[PDB]
C-alpha cells in the first residue's frame with residue numbers, strides 16, 4: 001500500500017502536523033464532516049492517481065452507473081485521435097484503463113481495485129492514460145479554456161509541458177478538464193496554514209459530488225463523508 005493507503009480515522013493525520021495550532025484547528029473541523037481518509041504517495045502524480053481510484057471505488061456494485069461509464073470510456077480513443085495522438089502510441093495506456101474498469105464490473109471488490117492502484121506498473125499506465133485524456137480534452141476545446149481560464153495562455157505548450165509528462169503538478173485547469181472529460185463531479189477541501197476558514201470548491205460548480213479530496217501540503221488525499 002505504498003501508492004494508496006488503507007483507510008484511517010481522520011484525526012490520525014494530526015501526527016503529520018504536531019503542535020501546529022492552525023492545522024490542528026482545521027483537521028478537528030474536517031473531522032466533524034468526514035469520517036475517514038486514505039493517503040497517496042507524493043510523487044507528482046497524486047491528483048490523477050487519487051481521482052482515478054476514488055471515482056472507480058464509488059462505482060462498485062452500481063450496475064447502471066458502470067454500464068454508462070464503460071460506454072463513455074469506449075469513446076475516449078476518438079477524443080485522443082481528434083487531438084493528434086496516434087493509436088499505436090496510446091494503445092497500451094487505453095487498454096490498462098479499460099482493464100481496471102472491467103475489474104470494477106467483474107470482480108467488484110475494494111481489495112482487488114486497491115491492489116491494481118498499488119501495482120507500480122498498472123497504476124502508472126492508468127495515470128499516463130488519464131494525463132493523455134486531460135491533454136486531449138483541453139486541446140480539442142482550446143477556445144473554451146482561453147475564454148474562461150486565461151486569454152493570454154499558450155494551450156499547446158501548456159499541455160506539452162504541464163499535462164502530458166509524468167510527475168507534473170496540477171492546477172484548476174487540469175482538474176476542471178479531467179472532471180469534464182469523464183463526467184466526474186468532485187469536491188476539493190483546502191487545508192493551509194493561514195488563519196482562515198476551512199473551505200472547498202466543487203467541479204463543476206453545479207454538482208452533487210461522487211469524490212471528495214483533501215488538498216494539504218501540495219498533496220491530494222481521499223476523504224470519506
Ligand SMILES: *CC(=O)/N=C/c1cccc(C)c1
Pocket residue numbers: 041042043044045046047217218219220
Ligand atoms: C499530488 C502530488 O503528487 N504532490 C506531490 C508534492 C508534494 C509535496 C510537495 C510538492 C511540490 C509536491
